[PDB]
Amino acid sequence: PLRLLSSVHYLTDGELPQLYDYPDDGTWLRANFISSLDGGATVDGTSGAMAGPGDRFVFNLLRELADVIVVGVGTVRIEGYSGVRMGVVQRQHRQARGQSEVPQLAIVTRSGRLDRDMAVFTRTEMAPLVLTTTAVADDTRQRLAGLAEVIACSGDDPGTVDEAVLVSQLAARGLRRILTEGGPTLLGTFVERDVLDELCLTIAPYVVGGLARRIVTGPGQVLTRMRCAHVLTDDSGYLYTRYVKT
Numbered sequence: 160p161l162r163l164l165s166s167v168h169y170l171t172d173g174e175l176p177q178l179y180d181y182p183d184d185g186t187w188l189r190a191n192f193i194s195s196l197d198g199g200a201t202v203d204g205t206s207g208a209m210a211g212p213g214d215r216f217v218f219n220l221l222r223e224l225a226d227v228i229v230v231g232v233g234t235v236r237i238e239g240y241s242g243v244r245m246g247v248v249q250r251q252h253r254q255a256r257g258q259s260e261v262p263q264l265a266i267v268t269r270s271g272r273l274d275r276d277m278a279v280f281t282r283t284e285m286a287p288l289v290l291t292t293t294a295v296a297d298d299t300r301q302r303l304a305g306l307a308e309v310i311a312c313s314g315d316d317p318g319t320v321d322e323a324v325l326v327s328q329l330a331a332r333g334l335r336r337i338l339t340e341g342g343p344t345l346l347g348t349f350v351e352r353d354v355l356d357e358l359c360l361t362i363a364p365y366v367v368g369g370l371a372r373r374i375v376t377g378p379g380q381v382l383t384r385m386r387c388a389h390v391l392t393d394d395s396g397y398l399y400t401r402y403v404k405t
């Protein structure tokens with residue numbers, strides 16, 4: 160029943176994006192996270208310490224393929240969260256794929272409490288989207304006029320975000336190829352409401368002890384079965400995996 164894996168195939172620079180192709184139609188919510196061997200998501204608050212050149216490469220490539228990046232407000236506040244920086248060649252490939260110069264950025268909040276002076280608003284080329292509830296949308300739209308387009312993503316309850324609606328709200332705006340990179344609360348909701356189509360997980364060859372939290376936090380408890388689509392590796396021992404529901 161058991162089969163041993165090993166490096167069978169070197170990936171040319173055009174084969175690697177075909178592995179991470181989005182579906183030709185429909186909407187698709189992809190998660191990219193990185194994790195240690197013992198399920199540690201962070202090393203002293205950062206996740207950048209476990210990320211080597213390999214992971215970074217896949218990380219930027221995934222950004223290059225996305226119409227939009229969804230991020231929770233907690234992650235966006237953290238020390239050195241930039242605006243999405245597309246290099247000159249990345250912008251080229253995106254144009255050849257008919258996408259815009261840079262992927263759009265969507266910030267999720269239930270509270271609507273974002274500042275006019277946040278890092279995310281200030282040095283991003285293009286004005287980010289704010290995904291929040293019906294309850295707070297209008298006041299948030301006012302408080303951030305000229306910084307962000309504020310979009311209500313409530314379903315049946317005006318006091319919260321319905322994650323399936325969030326996703327549909329993005330598709331509505333031609334932003335059907337979605338990517339999320341954190342934080343663990345947002346991913347938590349995406350998993351609990353079962354709207355996560357695909358998980359891209361980097362397994363860093365480290366153990367970090369028991370202090371770090373997982374790539375997912377929250378009260379949720381589910382058993383979502385996924386299919387292994389591929390596993391990649393480099394000389395440093397990392398595993399770059401792709402899993403699809405169901």
Ligand SMILES: NC(=O)C1=CN([C@@H]2O[C@H](COP(=O)(O)OP(=O)(O)OC[C@H]3O[C@@H](n4cnc5c(N)ncnc54)[C@H](OP(=O)(O)O)[C@@H]3O)[C@@H](O)[C@H]2O)C=CC1
Nearest residue numbers: 200204206231232233234268269270341342344345348374
């Ligand atoms: N796994 C990794 O690799 C990552 C690890 N981290 C680490 O984890 C910590 C941050 O964790 P967290 O604060 O959970 O990161 P988040 O990005 O998940 O911040 C979550 C915020 O998003 C808003 N929100 C509103 N509706 C939703 C919804 N439906 N789903 C999700 N979020 C929603 C809330 O903001 P409001 O309160 O305004 O409603 C909530 O507080 C940091 O210490 C950082 O070091 C950070 C990034 C990625």
Ligand SMILES: CCc1nc(N)nc(N)c1C#C[C@H](C)c1cc(-c2ccncc2)ccc1OC
Nearest residue numbers: 191192193206210214218237239240340341361
């Ligand atoms: C590159 C790290 C990383 N790898 C993988 N496989 N999945 C992820 N979700 C993240 C991540 C991350 C968080 C969002 C993050 C990355 C980076 C970052 C990404 C790429 N190069 C330098 C920094 C900076 C700040 C960050 O949070 C504050």
